[PDB]
Amino acid sequence: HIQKVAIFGGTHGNELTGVFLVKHWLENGAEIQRTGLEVKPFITNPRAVKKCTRYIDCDLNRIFDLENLGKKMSEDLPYEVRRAQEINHLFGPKDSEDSYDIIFDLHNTTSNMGCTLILEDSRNNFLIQMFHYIKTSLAPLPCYVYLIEHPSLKYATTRSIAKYPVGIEVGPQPQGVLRADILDQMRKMIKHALDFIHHFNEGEEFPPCAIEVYKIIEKVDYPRDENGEIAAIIHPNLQDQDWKPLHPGDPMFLTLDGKTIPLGGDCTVYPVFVNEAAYYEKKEAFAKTTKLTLNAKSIRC
Amino acid sequence: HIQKVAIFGGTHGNELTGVFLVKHWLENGAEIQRTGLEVKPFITNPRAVKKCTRYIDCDLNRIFDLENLGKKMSEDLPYEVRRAQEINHLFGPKDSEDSYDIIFDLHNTTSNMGCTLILEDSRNNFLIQMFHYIKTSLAPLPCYVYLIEHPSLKYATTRSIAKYPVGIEVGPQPQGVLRADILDQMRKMIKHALDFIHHFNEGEEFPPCAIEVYKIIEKVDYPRDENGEIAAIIHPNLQDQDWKPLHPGDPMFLTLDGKTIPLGGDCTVYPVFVNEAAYYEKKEAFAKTTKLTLNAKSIRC
Ligand SMILES: CP(=O)(O)N[C@@H](CC(=O)O)C(=O)O
Ligand SMILES: CP(=O)(O)N[C@@H](CC(=O)O)C(=O)O
Ligand SMILES: [Zn+2]
Numbered sequence: 001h002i003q004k005v006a007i008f009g010g011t012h013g014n015e016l017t018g019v020f021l022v023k024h025w026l027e028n029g030a031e032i033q034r035t036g037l038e039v040k041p042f043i044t045n046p047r048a049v050k051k052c053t054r055y056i057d058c059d060l061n062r063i064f065d066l067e068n069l070g071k072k073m074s075e076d077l078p079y080e081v082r083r084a085q086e087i088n089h090l091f092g093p094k095d096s097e098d099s100y101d102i103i104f105d106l107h108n109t110t111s112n113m114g115c116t117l118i119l120e121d122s123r124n125n126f127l128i129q130m131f132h133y134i135k136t137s138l139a140p141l142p143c144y145v146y147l148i149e150h151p152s153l154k155y156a157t158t159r160s161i162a163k164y165p166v167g168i169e170v171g172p173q174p175q176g177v178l179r180a181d182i183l184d185q186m187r188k189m190i191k192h193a194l195d196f197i198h199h200f201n202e203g204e205e206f207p208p209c210a211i212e213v214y215k216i217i218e219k220v221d222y223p224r225d226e227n228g229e230i231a232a233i234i235h236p237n238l239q240d241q242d243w244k245p246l247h248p249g250d251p252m253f254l255t256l257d258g259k260t261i262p263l264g265g266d267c268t269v270y271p272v273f274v275n276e277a278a279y280y281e282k283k284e285a286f287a288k289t290t291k292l293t294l295n296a297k298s299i300r301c
Numbered sequence: 302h303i304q305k306v307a308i309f310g311g312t313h314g315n316e317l318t319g320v321f322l323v324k325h326w327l328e329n330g331a332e333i334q335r336t337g338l339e340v341k342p343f344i345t346n347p348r349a350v351k352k353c354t355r356y357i358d359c360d361l362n363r364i365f366d367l368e369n370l371g372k373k374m375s376e377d378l379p380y381e382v383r384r385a386q387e388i389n390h391l392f393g394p395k396d397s398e399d400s401y402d403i404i405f406d407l408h409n410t411t412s413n414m415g416c417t418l419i420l421e422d423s424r425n426n427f428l429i430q431m432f433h434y435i436k437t438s439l440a441p442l443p444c445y446v447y448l449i450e451h452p453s454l455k456y457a458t459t460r461s462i463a464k465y466p467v468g469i470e471v472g473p474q475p476q477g478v479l480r481a482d483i484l485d486q487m488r489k490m491i492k493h494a495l496d497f498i499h500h501f502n503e504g505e506e507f508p509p510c511a512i513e514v515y516k517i518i519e520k521v522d523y524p525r526d527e528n529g530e531i532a533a534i535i536h537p538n539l540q541d542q543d544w545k546p547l548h549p550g551d552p553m554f555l556t557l558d559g560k561t562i563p564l565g566g567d568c569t570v571y572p573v574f575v576n577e578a579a580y581y582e583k584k585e586a587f588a589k590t591t592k593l594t595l596n597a598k599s600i601r602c
């Protein structure tokens with residue numbers, strides 16, 4: 001049974017859709033309340049939000065792990081590390097039964113990804129059923145599921161605190177910009193997610209369901225010159241073609257001289273986060289993913 | 302006769318198309334050289350480029366005036382001030398005959414403005430002729446001219462150093478990103494600008510011409526709180542509709558609730574820089590322009 005729900009906004013301070021909503025919701029939350037459901041809206045990175053930048057000392061959505069949450073409180077720590085602890089204490093602790101049940105973390109991307117749900121665990125049948133529900137509600141408005149569970153990769157998100165972590169990504173949108181159509185898409189996504197929880201809490205039964213997801217394989221950097229500067233850019237056939245298949249023959253990058261660097265490798269892939277501003281400093285031009293199906297067992301409260 | 306020509310990129314450090322070309326052209330100018338014409342590429346704000354921020358201490362493209370350029374040099378002064386003077390000493394002095402003849406200043410905008418030329422002087426026959434040549438040469442691809450001449454508004458641009466300052470602005474592109482299609486557009490604009498200069502220098506006579514331009518009337522802020530926080534955002538109809546006519550009854554802003562706030566007044570207007578990331582701090586949702594026609598007298602070298 002689902003009791004404790006939060007919506008985080010402003011994990012990244014220059015992703016204004018979430019910030020705008022949460023800050024309105026703090027003043028009037030009617031939209032995010034249901035019957036017998038209390039959800040708490042919350043500004044994750046208030047300082048980065050004030051400076052309208054992604055972060056102050058380091059990326060908040062990467063540090064919710066033992067290395068960082070186990071450090072001694074201290075004014076000498078990076079701001080985000082201090083803030084990660086404050087959040088763990090408020091909405092976790094992480095890996096405890098006292099933690100929040102569900103956390104929705106709201107994000108924006110410059111990539112042409114549309115409505116996107118981040119899945120941190122392939123086995124969780126509750127999430128697969130939620131995601132199936134939202135996907136289907138939204139349609140024919142498309143909505144895709146990025147699955148980030150992986151051995152060496154995968155990062156400790158802000159929402160990993162909860163038993164049920166949910167990432168909500170909407171793009172394309174420039175950083176520092178509030179576009180109405182994106183705002184609307186993110187509201188519709190939440191509308192359905194919260195509806196599903198309520199529906200489940202009034203003991204509805206959901207049959208088995210399948211969904212298609214995109215599983216991370218590896219991350220590709222920009223081809224780089226002899227000093228570490230970018231020597232080629234996202235080829236225009238690849239620009240804005242997130243989710244769509246890319247075959248070994250196909251064009252990845254383009255040089256100033258007009259030279260085209262093709263995919264190579266062995267098989268088809270589905271690129272994600274194509275040309276995301278914030279990933280330039282992470283050496284990620286885009287991420288390679290395989291398409292695969294996940295099956296959920298029926299569930300009931 | 303035109304001798305000294307510069308191309309500035311990186312005036313704003315997170316506008317990467319200019320920075321990316323200029324760094325390449327610094328390593329191989331072939332593309333921007335014309336026979337009998339030497340063109341110097343230059344990075345105006347190398348420091349803001351390092352951090353991929355718009356600026357360090359203040360906006361570089363607003364301070365090339367007497368107040369700042371006449372100041373005594375010291376380390377208490379904002380970086381950009383100290384930097385502006387250093388640029389005046391290399392490509393000016395501004396208002397002197399020893400200054401460069403033409404400076405092209407390269408920019409990107411989040412607004413959906415397409416290929417855009419900034420005209421600083423409505424009576425400058427030479428520029429008007431150049432712009433008409435570029436417009437004509439780019440067709441059917443559109444090209445738009447924004448006349449920032451105004452008694453009160455109008456600011457001291459990096460490029461105002463030259464006898465003939467030219468601003469090149471290409472959108473939409475998110476800050477901190479390199480799109481190929483936007484890059485290609487800026488290169489073509491430059492190709493044709495240099496071609497024009499060369500042709501003129503080889504004595505070709507240019508008959509009189511007319512161009513449509515858009516003259517700044519006034520800037521419009523987002524409607525705000527009692528706290529000064531944004532209370533409404535760019536309406537979906539207005540979004541991405543730069544240059545297109547906006548009538549008095551038409552939707553302008555949108556609340557979460559969401560009520561539409563219409564234009565008001567009684568004259569039609571032409572909106573420019575709709576939803577520009579960098580202008581949120583400047584408190585400009587968009588600029589209202591009136592669209593008029595300018596003539597050039599014929600010219601010859
Ligand atoms: C480009 P973003 O910061 O909105 N994407 C998230 C992805 C996620 O939510 O896991 C991140 O990089 O932290
Ligand atoms: C969107 P931008 O900052 O590159 N445009 C210039 C306008 C210009 O080039 O005059 C500015 O705001 O100073
Ligand atoms: Zn984010």
Ligand SMILES: [Zn+2]
Pocket residue numbers: 312313316407408409
């Ligand atoms: Zn600029």
